[PDB]
Amino acid sequence: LNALASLGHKGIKTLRTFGRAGLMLFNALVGKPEFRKHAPLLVRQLYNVGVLSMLIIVVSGVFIGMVLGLQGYLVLTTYSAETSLGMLVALSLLRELGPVVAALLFAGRAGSALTAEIGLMRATEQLSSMEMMAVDPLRRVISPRFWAGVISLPLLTVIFVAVGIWGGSLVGVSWKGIDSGFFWSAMQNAVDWRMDLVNCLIKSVVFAITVTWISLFNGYDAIPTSAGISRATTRTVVHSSLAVLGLDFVLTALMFG
């Protein structure tokens, strides 16, 4: 068929980008494990992706806990169980929304703006002139950014769950008349460490490997004109947002199957 040949171009094309994503990343993390240069080089990158992404997490983290403490308060009162609020928002945050929402906003702020800095750096040929400097940029400019992600997002989640659960302890305890000593008490024997507390990290640290890789790859093969780069930014947000939910449904099957 005449139209089935237009798919024959795509089925080869869309798989070669997966070949480029492995081949770029494999060259990024092999050989010369130098630490004298990278240790001040990396800590400037954590100011880029960690500190600037910190404020949006906490100011949104108080709004999720205040909503779940408000909306959850109606569902417990219709089933007449006040004490369950402490084992509800602790339950819901630490296993469902903690890894999923924080990774969404991280794909929002740090996921997109990282891709902008990469493609712009090829657009003004700062990349193509660094090869004339005979320094391989994939270990030089990519791997300081790639480790800056996967170290950051676990520390972006544990700040999210904590300030999330503190705001949940406001509206139920203080405003909606519940004793303070009763609220933490049901929460004390609520959750264990082995299949809940470290399990929050396992969902979060496997998200950081994907989002940082899917962001920094789109900066590496984007069209260097000013049209193609902003196309690549809005291709990064939509592709990470499927991959966070394409993984979470798998990663909620193993832990609770």
Partner 1 sequence: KKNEIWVGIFLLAALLAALFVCLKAANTEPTYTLYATFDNIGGLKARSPVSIGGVVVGRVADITLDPKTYLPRVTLEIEQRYNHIPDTSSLSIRTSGLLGEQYLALNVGFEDPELGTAILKDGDTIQDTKSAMVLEDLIGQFLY
Give residues in contact with partner 1 (CB under 8 A): 4-5, 7-9, 11-12, 15-23, 26, 43-44, 46-47, 50-51, 54, 90, 94, 155, 158-159, 161-163, 165, 184, 187-193, 196-197, 250, 253-254, 257
User: CB of 56: closest distance to partner 1 in angstroms?
Assistant: 14
Task: Report CA-CA distances (Å) from 209 to 41, 97, 147.
Answer: 20, 18, 9
The count of other CB atoms within 10 Å of the CB of residue 216 is 25
User: CB of 162: closest distance to partner 1 in angstroms?
Assistant: 4
**The CA-based dihedral angle spanning residues 220, 223, 228, 230, taken in that order and rounded to the nearest 10 degrees:** 20
Contact partners, residue 14, CB within 8 Å, separation at least 6: none
User: CB of 12: closest distance to partner 1 in angstroms?
Assistant: 6
Alpha-carbon distance of 158 to 171, in angstroms, equals 21
- Whose Cβ is closer to partner 1: residue 116's or residue 159's? 159
- Whose Cβ is closer to partner 1: residue 154's or residue 233's? 154
Alpha-carbon distance of 104 to 184, in angstroms, equals 29
User: CB of 159: closest distance to partner 1 in angstroms?
Assistant: 5
- Whose Cβ is closer to partner 1: residue 188's or residue 226's? 188
- Whose Cβ is closer to partner 1: residue 66's or residue 233's? 66
User: CB of 107: closest distance to partner 1 in angstroms?
Assistant: 19
Half-sphere exposure of 192 toward its Cβ, with a 13 Å CA cutoff?
A: 2
User: CB of 9: closest distance to partner 1 in angstroms?
Assistant: 6
> Among residues 57, 32, 21, 39, which one has the least CA distance to residue 156?
57
- Whose Cβ is closer to partner 1: residue 118's or residue 165's? 165
220, 120 contact by CB (below 8 A): no
Alpha-carbon distance of 17 to 54, in angstroms, equals 32
User: CB of 49: closest distance to partner 1 in angstroms?
Assistant: 11
The b-or-e profile of 62-73 (16+ CB within 10 A means b, else e) is eebbbebbeebb
Q: At what angle do helices 98-123 and 54-77 cross, to 10 degrees?
A: 160
- Whose Cβ is closer to partner 1: residue 8's or residue 31's? 8
37, 135 contact by CB (below 8 A): no
Q: At what angle do helices 143-150 and 152-169 cross, to 10 degrees?
A: 30
- Whose Cβ is closer to partner 1: residue 123's or residue 202's? 202
